[PDB]
A paper describes a structure:
With the new chain-extended nucleoside oligophosphates in hand, we go on to investigate in detail their interaction with ribonuclease A, a model protein containing a polycationic active site and for which X-ray crystal structures are relatively straightforward to obtain. Thus, we go on to investigate in detail the interaction of the polyanionic constructs with ribonuclease A, a model protein containing a polycationic active site and for which X-ray crystal structures are relatively straightforward to obtain. This work presents a combined experimental and quantum chemical approach to understanding the interactions of RNase A with the new nucleoside hexa- and heptaphosphate constructs. To better comprehend RNase A and nucleoside oligophosphate interactions, we examine the correlation between the experimental and calculated protein–ligand interactions by combining efforts in crystallographic and computational investigations in the present work. The combination of the CCSD(T) approach with the appropriate energy decomposition scheme enables deciphering the influence of the oligophosphate chain length and of individual polypeptide and nucleoside residues on ligand binding.
Here, we demonstrate by extending adenosine monophosphate (AMP) and uridine monophosphate (UMP) to their corresponding nucleoside hexaphosphates, while adenosine diphosphate (ADP) and uridine diphosphate (UDP) are phosphate chain-extended to the corresponding nucleoside heptaphosphates. In the presence of Mo(NCMe)3(CO)3,35 [PPN]2[TBA]1 readily reacted with anhydrous NMPs and NDPs, yielding the corresponding hexa- and heptaphosphates after subsequent hydrolysis. Anion-exchange HPLC purification of the resulting compounds provided the ammonium salts of adenosine/uridine hexaphosphates (50% yield for p6A and 29% for p6U) and adenosine/uridine heptaphosphates (24% yield for p7A and 17% for p7U). This result represents the first direct chemical syntheses of nucleoside-5′-hexa- and -heptaphosphates. Additionally, we found that the hydrolytic ring-opening process exhibits less selectivity when leading to the nucleoside heptaphosphates as compared with that leading to the nucleoside hexaphosphates, with observed formation of pentametaphosphate and NDPs. Aqueous solutions of the purified nucleoside hexa- and heptaphosphates were observed to be stable for at least a week, as confirmed by 31P{1H} NMR spectroscopy.
Numbering used by the authors: 1 to 124
């Protein structure tokens, strides 16, 4: 079975310098990572950093999670990311996304042993 940690990698890791794609990055990535299979995932962030760099955030700045848990962590450095937001015309199963590239601090929730990211909470 896919662990929460593996799911975080499938949903959010895109190790590279920045978004690269032959067509609309978000439409191709949301499809290829199976984020459009059971619904159109409405918002999603891809992180263009090494897996070690993202995992290291779990020992960086402790912040409250949007859901009130306290196992969220904000990166000290800005990171290269791409946000995918479903369009107003998007309707499952014909999902469609707008692509926003950014350099922002990421906030992830971490869990488990080893303590690793399992949920992407926000970017600031
Ligand atoms: N330590 C944590 N702190 C906060 N939330 C956490 C933590 N661990 C797991 N979660 C889970 O996050 C899921 C979304 O919950 P909530 O956010 O509280 O409700 P929502 O109404 O907002 O859902 P939505 O559909 O609108 O937006 P999602 O697309 O994010 O949902 P889903 O993909 O299924 O979530 P994930 O797998 O984690 O992807 P991702 O890493 O977040 O991208 C939900 O299962 C929570 O239990």
């Amino acid at each position: 079975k896919e662990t929460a940690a593996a799911k975080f990698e499938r949903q959010h890791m895109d190790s590279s310098t920045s978004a690269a794609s032959s067509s609309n990055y978000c439409n191709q990535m949301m499809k290829s990572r199976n984020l459009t299979k059971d619904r159109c995932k409405p918002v999603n962030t891809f992180v263009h950093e090494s897996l070690a760099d993202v995992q290291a955030v779990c020992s960086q700045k402790n912040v409250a999670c949007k859901n009130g848990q306290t196992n969220c962590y904000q990166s000290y450095s800005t990171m290269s990311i791409t946000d995918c937001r479903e369009t107003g015309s998007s309707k499952y199963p014909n999902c469609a996304y707008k692509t926003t590239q950014a350099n922002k601090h990421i906030i992830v929730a971490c869990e488990g042993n080893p303590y690793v990211p399992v949920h992407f909470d926000a970017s600031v």
